[PDB]
Structure 1
Amino acid sequence: AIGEFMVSLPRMVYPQPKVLTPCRKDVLVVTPWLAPIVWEGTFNIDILNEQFRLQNTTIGLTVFAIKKYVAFLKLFLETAEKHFMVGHRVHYYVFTDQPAAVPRVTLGTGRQLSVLEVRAYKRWQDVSMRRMEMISDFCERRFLSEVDYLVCVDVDMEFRDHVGVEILTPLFGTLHPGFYGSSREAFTYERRPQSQAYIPKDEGDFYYGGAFFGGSVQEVQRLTRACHQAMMVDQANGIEAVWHDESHLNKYLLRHKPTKVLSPEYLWDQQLLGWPAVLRKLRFTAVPKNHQAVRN
């Protein structure tokens, strides 16, 4: 459930928070609109697990595996079993044009998987963009009655470390690993005023990654419907945003600030970026792929 009567926490023994010691001295841990930025060292997972288990929380995880991307599912789901919301109720929603090709992955107790058959668009850009419409369409079909939160991710990924209830909040985005240290003018927002995703050079908080966003079902429905409607306006005007759904996600989260922001621990590419000191954990990472080959 979300927003229901909360019972009391049990007695717990844990280290006292240190008011006069910053939890991180190297990174920003709260946005200017008072949303936590989630890094290792900012949270006590024992306290959070108690809070969310007492609310009987169910987390949905959406993933699209269309055309050749079915190949990514086995590692994605295996590693999600090891690292994603372990101990909590989970419902995986695998959207695919090939149900027969979803691997039989053994799930832990309290975890379930549904296969949702959808059409396959020809262009990879359209496959990626139409996720917003598809997630929105399923936010009445299933999600509102089945889960409390939705987490929406790319499939060409693997979990390597804990991803848990510390992410859960009404609306979150994730810092894209290529831009967390960049100035806003260097962010690859859409810069053409003719697109609904347009963001001027002097605006922007962060560059959020298309590959990991989420929130309550209500907030995810809002986000995905808004991004889809914006993409349909652009299509009618003969323009396609520079980074497709990611461009529209960024416009939405500029104008509707997230209530948590995930650090790049939650969206990383070790091949391209290594393992910087500022990353104490690499939680959810890109898997190698010949992009051109696998998209066609």
Structure 2
Amino acid sequence: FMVSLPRMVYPQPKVLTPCRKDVLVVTPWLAPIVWEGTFNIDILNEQFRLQNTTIGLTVFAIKKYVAFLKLFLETAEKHFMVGHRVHYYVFTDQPAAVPRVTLGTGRQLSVLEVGAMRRMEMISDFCERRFLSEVDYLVCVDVDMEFRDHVGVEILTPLFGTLHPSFYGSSREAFTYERRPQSQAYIPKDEGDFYYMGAFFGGSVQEVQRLTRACHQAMMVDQANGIEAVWHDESHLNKYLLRHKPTKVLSPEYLWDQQLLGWPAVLRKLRFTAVP
């Protein structure tokens, strides 16, 4: 059950003035594409706080990648879901190298030791029961990243993918999908909506487990068939999101590399970015 929103004073949405005219803000299957200017964060924060939403964030930090954790967590504290309950799940081969990062109230961190792309398996079968019990949504990201601006409840939905920053302007034939019919991740040149980046996807616990289960199974089939998809987990993610349309798509504001790609006019904010 969802209670009434309180009285709120904000600018009237205007039907005969689009928010953004420069970009596609809804997919052909009617999923919002999330850009700055498309959402009133006060309205969304109210909706999700009234549901006492808890967001789990998974991150893998194996071998040398433990070095990225301090900046990743410190900036997540500044920018990720502030005001909401957050549970970070850090998967690592070096529990003692996880930095002591100070967390705001309502936020917690769990270190999960793993053996010394396997992310799909670890998210899916091993952590299944726990996630269902502890969080409402799961967000799965790369660790070699930092938050630079707001990343909030505007992203939450049963299933989301993020536009890869190198391909958002590209034709589908240019997308680096797996192109060999022998792979489970195969997508032909006349198919594809977008090229989604493996570094930022998520949704409800149920939908994320479905996705990671499906991708883990497809990867296993490929392995048994002696084939490895061109872009590994990302290739399989793209195949999944082709056949199971996401209910929101995040713009490249949500996964950017300023060193590689600069700061184009179309991006009003750079929210979550590669660390060189």
TM over 0.5, shorter chain? yes
Counterpart Cα distance in 1 of 2:231 and 2:87: 29
CA positional deviation for 1:140: 2.2
After TM superposition, the runs of 4+ consecutive aligned structure 1 residues lying more than 6 A away are none
Could you report, residue by residue, the CA deviation over 1:63-94 in whole angstroms, capped at 9, with x for unpaired residues? 00000000000000000000000000000000
Could you report, residue by residue, the CA deviation over 1:243-277 in whole angstroms, capped at 9, with x for unpaired residues? 00000000000000000000000000000000000
Whether the aligned pair in 2 keeps the contact of 1:136 and 1:225 (CA below 8 Å) is yes
- Counterpart mapping for 1:189-200 below 5 A: 189-200=177-188
Whether the aligned pair in 2 keeps the contact of 1:174 and 1:208 (CA below 8 Å) is yes
CA positional deviation for 1:40: 0.1
Task: Normalising by structure 2, report the TM-score.
Answer: 0.99
Name stretches of at least 5 consecutive residues in structure 1 with no aligned partner: 121-128, 289-296
CA positional deviation for 1:138: 4.0
Answering whether residue 128 of structure 2 is matched by residue 132 of structure 1, we say no
Whether the aligned pair in 2 keeps the contact of 1:66 and 1:98 (CA below 8 Å) is yes
Counterpart Cα distance in 2 of 1:138 and 1:40: 36
Counterpart Cα distance in 2 of 1:139 and 1:6: 29
Counterpart Cα distance in 2 of 1:19 and 1:25: 13
1:85 is aligned, of 81, 87, 111, to 81
Q: Percent identity?
A: 99
The residue matched to 1:48 in structure 2 has which SS?
helix
1:211 is aligned, of 196, 199, 209, to 199
Counterpart Cα distance in 2 of 1:138 and 1:148: 18
Could you report, residue by residue, the CA deviation over 1:225-257 in whole angstroms, capped at 9, with x for unpaired residues? 000000000000000000000000000000000
2:56 matched residue in structure 1: 60
Whether the aligned pair in 2 keeps the contact of 1:139 and 1:217 (CA below 8 Å) is no
Counterpart Cα distance in 2 of 1:161 and 1:58: 20
Whether the aligned pair in 2 keeps the contact of 1:83 and 1:159 (CA below 8 Å) is yes
Whether the aligned pair in 2 keeps the contact of 1:268 and 1:285 (CA below 8 Å) is yes
Whether the aligned pair in 2 keeps the contact of 1:139 and 1:221 (CA below 8 Å) is no
- Counterpart mapping for 1:80-119 below 5 A: 80-119=76-115
Answering whether residue 255 of structure 2 is matched by residue 259 of structure 1, we say no
The residue matched to 1:203 in structure 2 has which SS?
coil
Could you report, residue by residue, the CA deviation over 1:167-190 in whole angstroms, capped at 9, with x for unpaired residues? 000000000000000000000000
Whether the aligned pair in 2 keeps the contact of 1:52 and 1:165 (CA below 8 Å) is yes
Task: Normalising by structure 1, report the TM-score.
Answer: 0.93
Q: CA RMSD in A?
A: 0.5
The residue matched to 2:118 in structure 1 has which SS?
helix
Counterpart Cα distance in 2 of 1:115 and 1:250: 29
Could you report, residue by residue, the CA deviation over 1:185-232 in whole angstroms, capped at 9, with x for unpaired residues? 000000000000000000000000000000000000000000000000
Whether the aligned pair in 2 keeps the contact of 1:58 and 1:91 (CA below 8 Å) is yes
Could you report, residue by residue, the CA deviation over 1:20-45 in whole angstroms, capped at 9, with x for unpaired residues? 00110100000000000000000000
Counterpart Cα distance in 2 of 1:40 and 1:268: 14
CA positional deviation for 1:142: 1.1
Counterpart Cα distance in 2 of 1:78 and 1:137: 29
CA positional deviation for 1:137: 2.4
Counterpart Cα distance in 1 of 2:70 and 2:250: 25
Counterpart Cα distance in 1 of 2:224 and 2:186: 16
CA positional deviation for 1:139: 4.0
User: Paired residues, what number?
Assistant: 276
Answering whether residue 66 of structure 2 is matched by residue 70 of structure 1, we say yes
Counterpart Cα distance in 1 of 2:226 and 2:218: 12
Could you report, residue by residue, the CA deviation over 1:79-121 in whole angstroms, capped at 9, with x for unpaired residues? 000000000000000000000000000000000000000013x
Counterpart Cα distance in 2 of 1:91 and 1:141: 15
The residue matched to 2:215 in structure 1 has which SS?
helix
Counterpart Cα distance in 2 of 1:138 and 1:28: 38
